[PDB]
């Protein structure tokens, strides 16, 4: 639907995305990635407005991959978030507005520290311990601040996210049909297939 | 508030033959309840055995006959008198239409001629842009009064051989040009009596192998 959730644990960014895409009266498909890999250690999730989301993904993706050819050097996650905020900021003033929210989760190798960035459509970046978007992001903020400790490893963090979805299934009326969860560990970018 | 779309009433009717074609329509031009002129051609020849009529809001209708006869000319210089196919002509308007899709023309246009094979050809264009090749299509204001009579007298649609009770659909028999002249005349006799934008006159253009033949038949003046 719109549900993109983020939790940073001690050694990973975990971004999870809605399996479903509804346009029109029906649920057209129940599988469609709402993420594009930018770099080997940088991953971007996007949700929002029909049809803009795609064009504003692959426009970023090419541009950021252009830099990586030119200089043979994967940009910081710190850097990456700036490039997108700039592109958004510029686009609100224009003839077309771009309704798109982005979570950028990446692994800095300069700092060796995971970092997650949350950008809203307006054009405000904010680095967070965890974040969300839409009216959907509400149900999750309150489980997280109870059980989050700033030390968890990938397995304790993965179970925590399972609780969150479990809540989200009870209370929200829009379905979405589970999540694809993706992990940016110390190097890798792997899709866990379990819930 | 300025509104740059009017209406001028009037109706056309395209019947295809097996070597002939017929584009007919009335000569009555109107605006609300005032009759401007009782007689006023709508169905113009474009040479090369294409006949066109762009019926609806008369103001657009001349503008889309302008650019059309213009383009008929300018094909013939550059292809050095390759004769313009009824079929190719179709796909051409479709560009002229679409070209003003963000300022439409309110006309419902029909072109008609013979194709290479010698069969009749009727096309009719969506006013916005697209089009479909037909066998018969009315358009214009009293379109919805004339169409459903033609589909019962040409296609024998919902008729069956008698005694066979639904099991045998009545067979298609191809109509003579003598027969299709009478059909038109009946249609546009009835249209007058129940709709107040048909009357005065009817103009048939018949196109065959020979060329263009004209026929004017009067209707009731009311």
């Amino acid at each position: 639907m719109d549900i993109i959730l983020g939790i940073r644990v001690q050694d990973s960014v975990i971004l999870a995305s809605s399996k479903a895409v509804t346009r029109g009266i029906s649920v057209l498909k129940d599988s469609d990635d709402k993420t594009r890999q930018l770099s080997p250690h940088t991953l971007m999730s996007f949700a929002g407005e029909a049809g803009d989301t795609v064009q504003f993904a692959e426009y970023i993706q090419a541009n950021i991959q252009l830099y990586s050819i030119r200089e043979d050097y994967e940009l910081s996650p710190q850097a990456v978030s700036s490039f997108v905020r700039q592109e958004l900021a510029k686009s609100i003033r224009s003839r077309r507005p771009y309704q798109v929210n982005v979570l950028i989760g990446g692994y800095d190798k300069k700092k060796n520290k995971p970092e997650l960035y949350q950008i809203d459509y307006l054009g405000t970046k904010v680095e967070l311990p965890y974040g969300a978007h839409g009216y959907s992001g509400f149900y999750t903020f309150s489980l997280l601040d109870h059980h989050y400790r700033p030390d968890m490893t990938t397995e304790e963090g993965l179970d925590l996210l399972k609780l969150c979805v479990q809540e989200l299934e009870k209370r929200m009326p829009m379905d979405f049909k589970g999540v694809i969860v993706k992990i940016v560990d110390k190097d890798g970018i792997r899709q866990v297939d379990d819930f | 508030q300025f509104n740059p779309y009017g209406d001028n009433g009037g109706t056309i009717l395209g019947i295809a033959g097996e070597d002939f074609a017929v584009l007919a329509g009335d000569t009555r031009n109107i605006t609300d309840y005032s009759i401007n002129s009782r007689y006023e051609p709508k169905v113009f020849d474009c040479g090369d055995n294409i006949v066109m009529s762009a019926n609806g809001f008369a103001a657009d209708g001349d503008a889309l006959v302008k650019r059309f006869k213009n383009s008929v000319k300018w094909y013939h210089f550059d292809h050095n008198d390759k004769k313009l196919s009824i079929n190719s002509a179709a796909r051409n308007i479709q560009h002229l239409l679409y070209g003003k899709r963000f300022f439409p023309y309110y006309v419902h246009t029909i072109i008609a001629g013979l194709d290479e094979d010698g069969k009749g050809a009727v096309y009719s264009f969506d006013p916005v842009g697209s089009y479909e090749r037909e066998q018969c299509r009315a358009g214009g204001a009293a379109a919805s009064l004339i169409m459903p009579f033609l589909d019962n007298q040409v296609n024998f649609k919902n008729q069956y051989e008698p005694g066979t009770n639904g099991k045998v659909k009545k067979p298609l028999k191809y109509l003579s040009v003598e027969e299709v002249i009478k059909l038109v005349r009946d249609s546009f006799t009835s249209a007058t009596e129940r709709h107040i934008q048909v009357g005065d006159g009817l103009e048939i253009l018949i196109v065959t192998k020979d060329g263009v033949r004209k026929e004017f038949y009067e209707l009731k003046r009311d």
Partner: protein, 204 residues
């Protein structure tokens, strides 16, 4: 809701005796939902200080913007911009985006280094230079702050006694507003050094 009332926050800036102090709350959220208590609103350029409140996307865009203008100034003259020609720089860039203005309110507070001189100035949307030599307030509880300041504030206060004052007026107004509530930073700026103190603010 207007754009300024989405992202809220307040900024207060009050002169002393040969010193100045600027302060804000750390909130950055939208409507009801709070996002972060990490957002800082106070930036600086040299020994001049700049606070900004209101539309969150215009916040970070005018920060990148001024940083670039006062970079290109410091290289040519080879010194820090004076607070008064910084005031001016602010005015012009608000006012040339007269249409589609940036939904902010900039508060400038600094010490002109050469003169020892305490210095504050205020702004709003398309750029009116509010001179004051008492205090300036901005942000989405600017009625509330105004009261407290005017009764508490006395001209001439010691850099140490100034800190008590601006303390009070920030705390009590933020929890009598909806759009401010998490945390609080105060910069006491004496002519040679910059103290940072985070207020214990009661949770909202």
């Amino acid at each position: 809701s207007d754009p300024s009332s989405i992202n809220g926050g307040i900024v207060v800036a009050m002169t002393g005796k040969d010193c100045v102090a600027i302060a804000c709350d750390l909130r950055l959220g939208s409507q009801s939902l709070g996002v972060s208590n990490k957002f800082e609103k106070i930036f600086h350029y040299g020994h001049v200080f700049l606070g900004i409140t209101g539309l969150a996307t215009d916040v970070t865009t005018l920060n990148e913007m001024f940083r670039y203008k006062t970079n290109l100034y410091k290289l040519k003259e080879e010194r820090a911009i004076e607070p008064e020609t910084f005031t001016q720089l602010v005015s012009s860039s608000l006012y040339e985006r007269r249409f589609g203005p940036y939904f902010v309110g900039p508060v400038v507070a600094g010490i002109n280094s050469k003169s020892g001189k305490p210095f504050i100035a205020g702004f709003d949307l398309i750029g009116c230079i509010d001179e004051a030599k008492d205090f300036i307030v901005s942000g989405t509880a600017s009625d509330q702050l105004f009261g407290m300041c005017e009764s508490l504030y006395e001209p001439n206060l010691e850099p140490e006694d100034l800190f008590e004052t601006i303390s009070q007026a920030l705390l009590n107004a933020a929890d009598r507003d909806a759009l401010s509530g998490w945390g609080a930073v105060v910069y006491i700026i004496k002519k040679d050094e910059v103290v940072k103190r985070y207020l214990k603010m009661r949770q909202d």
